[PDB]
Amino acid sequence: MLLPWLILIPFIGGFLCWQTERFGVKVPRWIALITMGLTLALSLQLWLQGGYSLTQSAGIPQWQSEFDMPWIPRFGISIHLAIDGLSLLMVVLTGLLGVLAVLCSWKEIEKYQGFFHLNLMWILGGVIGVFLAIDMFLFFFFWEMMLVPMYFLIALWGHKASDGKTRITAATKFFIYTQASGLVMLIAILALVFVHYNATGVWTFNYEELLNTPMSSGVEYLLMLGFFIAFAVKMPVVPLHGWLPDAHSQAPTAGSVDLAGILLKTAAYGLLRFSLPLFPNASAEFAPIAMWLGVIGIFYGAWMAFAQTDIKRLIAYTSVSHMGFVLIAIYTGSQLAYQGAVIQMIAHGLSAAGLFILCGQLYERIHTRDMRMMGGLWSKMKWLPALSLFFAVATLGMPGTGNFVGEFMILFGSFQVVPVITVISTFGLVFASVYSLAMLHRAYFGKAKSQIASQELPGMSLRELFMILLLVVLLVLLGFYPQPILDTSHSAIGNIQQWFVNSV
């Protein structure tokens, strides 16, 4: 019921901001803040009003709210929006990140600003629609239309048409690397539906009847690779992640909040929801390749993070290290491991968003991007580097932050299922420390005479500090007290694991 409205407010707000662009220029900032407030209101209403602590073994079909509507009846394509417990965590996270995106874009007036915000709400609404998606075509359409408006963001707002490096390399690799694999998973969807159409005799694009379709061995394996390729180019996996640092280092850091904190979520959401239950034996065969790619991703991202000299590419290469833990979590037979991935995933978004906001904040203070050029700014800034120290501290497994409990319950479940690949995996924490300290010492520890421009520094406004203070206190409560959201996700995680166990 609430789901059609909850995916449509982003699109309605873009229309109204661009409508009132003719009326005024200070309107869309204040319009956008209220519209994202309504998005979190409906999302938090579903958290509180709904039975978040529901039955742990109520089957694979279980939803607090559900919407159905005929869209293309010839294939049974329907607007099958349906919200689960873990999907509701995703919706509340993106509503909060949308508030941060529209708050960081405050006091940013240009030649056109309504165009920026209709695009801003369009891309955030696309991610919400992926998170509420049970029909395969609706899932794919939303997956691919959140991908078009970021291209305009990197192009027309990466820099205003002055340098050609903001389109022809950064934005173009971002677009092609995702869309080729999106078309791969579309033909994977179609091969799965056609083998189901031979089995039963109805053209259906719905998840519940495609869940248990009879397929011979050696056939569903190729479709599982087809799903995983599109789910491995969106979250950074080892062979195909070259788009991520270019995308984050060129887009404005509000666009980078969208590009890191929430676009990385949807691929592991799809690995939990759409790839694991549909292909149980194929995923059981593919598991060790996934573990090898996971350990390679953690070690690889940390080394590339240590070796880099700038900051946006630095945090962009932390992200590929973080997601390796999540991939190994998903491809195991443990309930605790999956519940560790969820808390690690929410904390991943919350620990990347603050760093990107602050890295963009530091650049507009000093007008210099290279990290090794500055140094010793602690005597000049009064609140930026202290808050930045805790966010770099929250990146690695420091307890009292959500990242520690996240990565570390994965390791418990991972050692429960398989010893040797887990005992390799744990060493990324040592490597997490070295790139964390490298960031901290090269940027803030030292003498302010490392740069001439490090001798005249501005002040920090109240609202940026307010939205940084909220994230640090929110992230500490998730580290100390993670029970409420684990009780929320228990049943959804449990039935996925029980199906992955029982179907093999």
Partner: protein, 612 residues
């Protein structure tokens, strides 16, 4: 009595105030609030200590809230205040109180003031969490909590990068130990399910009827965690470099706070180490080989702070032996004495290096008895206890008891190790003060007089002596494995240690009382410098631990300066663009070849139809 969290909240909350009053407060109010947090901690500790005496040595547990709970994974914020943990709390909330009270006077006059009293409170708070935790998880929060605080205090002076660069080697090395520590934590949950210490104690033999082979992996890798955090051979790197920070943080790190975490983990899991005897004796094996390493490196270099540091390494491993010889209460008795002397020994050295005014040398000063005898009596008291002198010393009872226990274990190599350690402690006891305080004063050390440090000096003077040895720590509340006692040979071993100490003290005094030309000759002899260079490398261990992984790590980073796999999956675009350029060049514009294209399409279509 429902006041355990006040030993954590009151310090920790004070840190938050000093983390946001980034120098905007004045000197006095910042100084009072920084000392008062730790002062309230000691007072609440004393109340629960005297109530623990009123409890009849009965443990008191308090769960605040469950941390995380999955249906097979139950972790809670459980605090256990038993006899072993009360003693380890007593050391911290007294020593940190005394060290931090000195810092109220030492820190003033320079910037970074509110910053330093912020991170000290966090450092103390992390150490209290480790020794009161009831679950191995919450205790893990203690381990890397105090590690990050050592990073924030070793690299406290961020201006020059030597001490600003020395902290990360400790940070890397302590997290290697923490990976080793968490490995055993995974294995214990896989094997025995619950991580609570007591429930683990009477769950371990129930689950282990059939298979035992994998418990040695748990316990050996658990041991690898304990050793690394404080000091030991496989990971002895950072304690020389940890001296690059200020004097009070070196005392806190090296004396009794952070280095007393690896002792608490072996002692708390003593029944768990009793489940396997060979992993328990292996602690003493590694302890016996580190007393042979950690001693004479104090003699080698001319840095006073490196002197006090190699002595701490020697003493911590001396404990590992004491725990390996199944003498648990005696080892904590050694700790109870050891905290008192080391902290003062470190602190007094700081007062004189304030008076030295940038000397940092042991060979260019002399005749310091006439400058100020207060620091003279400070080193003197510390030296006597360390050397195992029988004259009104505090720690000699602890050495006598553990060697009695060690010979009750019956390992002649361990008494040989103990005998050479007593001789080696007496060697570097008075050699430092004889080479520094005796001679001629060509550079005057301007002594500073003030009651603000004299009163804690008197308190530390009256505490580090044998008056402090009369305070028996609470050890009857845990009922550990009983430290066995020997009579008749106790007097024989006592006089043997006294003779060994006296011979070492007389040899140092004979090194002093000679011309020192033979000392100069052995400091100039080529085999002497070879051994000095060999033990500059410290059995090549820092040499080996740099050149085994560091330059391979820098080499693979230099090979990863440009990202390979992003480039090697760009070759579809490279092949497509180059093949597209070739197809564009295939077009001509001359219309004869267009019609030839039409004929050559007809030819291939007919050929492709005739092969079907």
């Amino acid at each position: 009595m429902n006041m355990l969290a006040l030993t954590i909240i009151l310090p920790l909350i004070g840190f938050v105030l000093l983390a946001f009053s980034r120098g905007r407060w004045s000197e006095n109010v910042s100084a009072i609030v920084g000392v008062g947090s730790v002062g309230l901690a000691a007072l609440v500790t004393a109340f629960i200590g005297v109530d623990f005496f009123a409890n009849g040595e009965q443990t008191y547990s308090q769960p605040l809230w469950t941390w995380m709970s999955v249906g097979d994974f139950n972790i809670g914020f459980n605090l256990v205040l038993d006899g072993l943990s009360l003693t380890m709390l007593s050391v911290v909330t007294g020593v940190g109180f005394l060290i931090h009270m000195y810092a109220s006077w030492y820190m003033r006059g320079e910037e970074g003031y509110s910053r330093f009293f912020a991170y000290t409170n966090l450092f103390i708070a992390s150490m209290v969490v480790l020794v009161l935790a009831d679950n191995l998880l919450l205790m893990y929060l203690g381990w890397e909590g105090v590690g990050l605080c050592s990073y924030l205090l070793i690299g406290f002076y961020y201006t020059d990068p030597k001490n600003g660069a020395a902290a990360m080697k400790a940070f890397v090395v302590t997290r290697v130990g923490d990976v080793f520590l968490a490995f055993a934590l995974f294995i214990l949950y896989n094997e025995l399910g619950t991580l609570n210490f007591r429930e683990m104690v009477e769950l371990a033999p129930a689950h282990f009827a059939d298979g035992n082979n994998m418990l040695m992996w748990a316990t050996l890798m658990l041991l690898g965690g304990a050793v690394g955090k404080s000091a030991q051979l496989p990971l002895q790197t950072w304690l020389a470099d940890a001296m690059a920070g200020p004097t009070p943080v070196s005392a806190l790190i090296h004396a009794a706070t952070m280095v007393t975490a690896g002792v608490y983990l072996i002692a708390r899991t003593h029944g768990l180490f009793l489940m396997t005897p060979e992993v328990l004796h292996l602690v003493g094996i590694v302890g016996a080989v580190t007393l042979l390493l950690a001693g004479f490196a104090a003699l080698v270099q001319t840095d006073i702070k490196r002197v006090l540091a190699y002595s701490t390494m020697s003493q911590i491993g001396y404990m590992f032996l004491a725990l390996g010889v199944q003498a648990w209460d005696a080892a904590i008795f050694h700790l109870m004495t050891h905290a008192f002397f080391k902290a003062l020994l470190f602190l007094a050295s700081g007062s004189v290096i304030l008076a030295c005014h940038h000397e940092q040398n042991i060979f260019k000063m002399g005749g310091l008895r006439k400058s100020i005898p207060l620091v003279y009596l400070c080193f003197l008291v510390g030296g006597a206890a360390l050397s195992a002198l029988p004259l009104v010393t505090a720690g000699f009872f602890s050495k006598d008891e553990i060697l009695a226990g060690a010979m009750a274990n019956g390992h002649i190599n361990l008494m040989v190790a103990g005998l050479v350690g007593a001789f080696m402690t007496s060697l570097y006891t008075f050699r430092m003060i004889f080479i520094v305080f005796h001679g001629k004063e060509q550079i005057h050390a301007h002594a500073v007089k003030g009651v603000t440090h004299s009163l804690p000096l008197i308190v530390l003077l009256i505490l580090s002596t044998f008056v402090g040895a009369l305070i028996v720590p609470p050890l009857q509340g845990v009922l550990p494995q009983t430290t066995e006692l020997a009579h008749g040979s106790m007097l024989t071993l006592e006089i043997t240690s006294g003779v060994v100490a006296v011979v070492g003290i007389l040899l140092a005094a004979w090194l002093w009382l000679g011309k020192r030309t033979l000392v100069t000759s052995i400091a100039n002899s080529a085999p002497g410098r070879l051994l000095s260079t060999w033990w500059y490398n410290a059995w090549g261990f820092d040499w080996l631990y740099d050149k085994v992984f560091v330059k391979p790590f820098l080499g693979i980073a230099w090979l990863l300066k440009r990202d390979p796999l992003n480039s090697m999956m760009n070759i579809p675009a490279v092949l497509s663009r180059f093949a597209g350029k070739g197809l564009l060049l295939s077009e001509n514009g001359y219309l004869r070849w267009y019609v030839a294209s039409m004929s050559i399409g007809a030819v291939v279509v007919l050929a492709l139809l005739m092969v079907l």
